[PDB]
UniProtKB/Swiss-Prot annotation, chains A, B:
This is 3-oxoacyl-[acyl-carrier-protein] synthase 2. PROSITE patterns: KS3_1 (PS00606), KS3_2 (PS52004). One of its GO terms (cellular component) is cytosol. One of its GO terms (biological process) is fatty acid elongation, saturated fatty acid. Homodimer. Pathway: Lipid metabolism; fatty acid biosynthesis. PANTHER family: 3-OXOACYL-[ACYL-CARRIER-PROTEIN] SYNTHASE, MITOCHONDRIAL, POLYKETIDE SYNTHASE-RELATED. Platensimycin binds at T269, H302, T306, P307, A308, H339. Platencin binds at T269, T306, P307, A308, H339. Its EC number is 2.3.1.179. It catalyses: a fatty acyl-[ACP] + malonyl-[ACP] + H(+) = a 3-oxoacyl-[ACP] + holo-[ACP] + CO2; (9Z)-hexadecenoyl-[ACP] + malonyl-[ACP] + H(+) = 3-oxo-(11Z)-octadecenoyl-[ACP] + holo-[ACP] + CO2; hexanoyl-[ACP] + malonyl-[ACP] + H(+) = 3-oxooctanoyl-[ACP] + holo-[ACP] + CO2; octanoyl-[ACP] + malonyl-[ACP] + H(+) = 3-oxodecanoyl-[ACP] + holo-[ACP] + CO2.
Amino acid sequence: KRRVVVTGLGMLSPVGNTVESTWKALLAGQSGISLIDHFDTSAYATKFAGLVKDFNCEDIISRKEQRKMDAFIQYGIVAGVQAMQDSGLEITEENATRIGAAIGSGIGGLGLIEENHTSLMNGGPRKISPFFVPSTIVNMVAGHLTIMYGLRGPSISIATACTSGVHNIGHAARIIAYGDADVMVAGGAEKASTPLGVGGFGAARALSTRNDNPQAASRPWDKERDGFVLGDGAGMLVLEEYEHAKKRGAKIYAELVGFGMSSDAYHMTSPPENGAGAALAMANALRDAGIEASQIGYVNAHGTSTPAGDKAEAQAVKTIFGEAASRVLVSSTKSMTGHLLGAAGAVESIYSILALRDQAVPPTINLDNPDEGCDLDFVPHEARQVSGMEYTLCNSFGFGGTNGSLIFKKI
Amino acid sequence: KRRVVVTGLGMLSPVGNTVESTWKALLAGQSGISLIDHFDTSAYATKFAGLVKDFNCEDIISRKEQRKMDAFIQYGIVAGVQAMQDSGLEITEENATRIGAAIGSGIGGLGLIEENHTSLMNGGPRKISPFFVPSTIVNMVAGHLTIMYGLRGPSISIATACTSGVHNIGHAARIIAYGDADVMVAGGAEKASTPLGVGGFGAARALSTRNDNPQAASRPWDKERDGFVLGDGAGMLVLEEYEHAKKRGAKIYAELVGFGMSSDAYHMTSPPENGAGAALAMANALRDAGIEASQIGYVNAHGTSTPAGDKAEAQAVKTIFGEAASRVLVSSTKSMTGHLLGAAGAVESIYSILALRDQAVPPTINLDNPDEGCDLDFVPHEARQVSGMEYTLCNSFGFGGTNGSLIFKKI
């Protein structure tokens, strides 16, 4: 039996370029949602998003090297470098073989696929950049980090839309627990705030259209919800075996103790009003950790601010916690940050971990009027203070009906 | 300890629309490589590919429903339906929860991303199909199958370029062995023979340019190699726990006994001349199965027909098998089929399984002149007959330096 702990955190988000700055902004209820300015949004129904602000990677990645990678990969590396540095791991020739990565993305290099397609349309195939493939495909964030640090252990990339971050982190732990690796860098990165990204989700009418007030648009569980808000970023954690980490004396942030997965088998984009698949994934993670629902203080919800989705999750928490439903705190940090698709599960695992360290729970800002069949404590406007919280649950219920939940324990 | 066996096979490939027809074409050395005719290839350096011929899914998927999915998803479902049917699995309300999927793709819905981008360029965002996202993203093959059969178990999608098929199959087995599922549909699907796909790989100069003779272009380990050949398709297998399958009395094709993963930590597209990462993945799968290299009769090689790549793999087989090197049969079925990227590991696992059933090894067609530092038996022109083969090794070494190997055992 091999235990997995978190020894390093890193991230880029709409409210901060580091872990701690991002953390502090969330506890103060700061929004990261701004108006889009890098492309003309005149014809667009949604003109805002959670954008990464003032991004600099010149020190980490050269300008020469920057040309071979879409922004999602650039975000992924920077956040990856932060997690490696935070962890305090020396990579030696005798170590390489046991350290790998499990980093994903939901859509991957959309920005660069558009550019190259535009080139092709106006110039033919000779104008297609020679780095087309390696700059856009999903597994290149893990490809780049492995080379950079000489990681010769297992390397995977899970692409499950909104559940990517949670699936990657959990399978990195399964890998570690199986014996295939000792350390894993895990997480997700996304940068889908492009014409095709805004338009595409816009075309399905899944996005909020509240352009008059961009920062109040993302309002999970509020009555005026009109769709999710798109966000960019990347979260990354260092996962490693307990005895390996203790032996070197690493910063141990927490322990990954449960991982649950499920499918809805219902609709390609919409969830069951029941919340049946969401319940199952929470149920499975609970069983996987061997704890009851009343031992979980805080649930970082999927909470995307969609009419149908917010109700289902609510209903699924009632079904699992039951009498502890009113006793458990459930908040959506997507009210400040927006939905980071493939990085959503990664950044939100960090929030769930940090909540255990500081005994503070981030709020669901903008919750002015709970939905009619809503009854739980959604940590409504300001951060709540807690005292003896040992477990947290992080939920991701994504497109295609693929669900996941992670359970963390304070050590 | 839970053993995983293969109880159902399904696939669409360039040499056949079914498993058996594909199998028979490979043993006869038939090529599936044709000239591209669905787009103007006048300016293109590569004008050929392994295309799926005479595809019909009207019986499986309606024309109404066909509009919401890229060709890769359409291929994935058809092959998935074949595997479900082949397996003989009844999905009941008491079963749903234990059956899931692990289906990936390397590039996903390229065809539909181009169409939608073209629409956007000529029409603005209102012309973007409302099914943009769900028709292109990688996890939608597993999304569609889960809904179709009511699979409520774990649902993941691994996207590791050329290793996708092998990573998905192996993690489906890890899931099964852990206890999260009893049955898993696993595999990959790809359809990257599009303007951006041919052009993009063309732009990196990774593709063969032998337009005078399309069927002799793919020639792994031959001296005249000038790049890999692109192919479309999808392979799918039903993986399930031994005792579950025996209890219902299923067709047991073989047992998944080993799974190895590694990274090269060298270059984003090129492998180490050494073959170091490839050796490690074979080494790890061997250790995972607990057998030595001399117990493996046949190795389905990665063998893409690239100068650099073919030498590295050769060198990696020498390092692992050593004195059994000349005793072991290694062939590349990509000489007939081409490189199916994310489906390559899935279709080639089936070939490795079928080889055990029929004691016949498919050839590496077109091998007229082995490379100078080549010395192994590459099953050169015609299928070889074998007698007491119990183990086979299937290799996938992909872009980003992500490697994998699967080991199968005859039962």
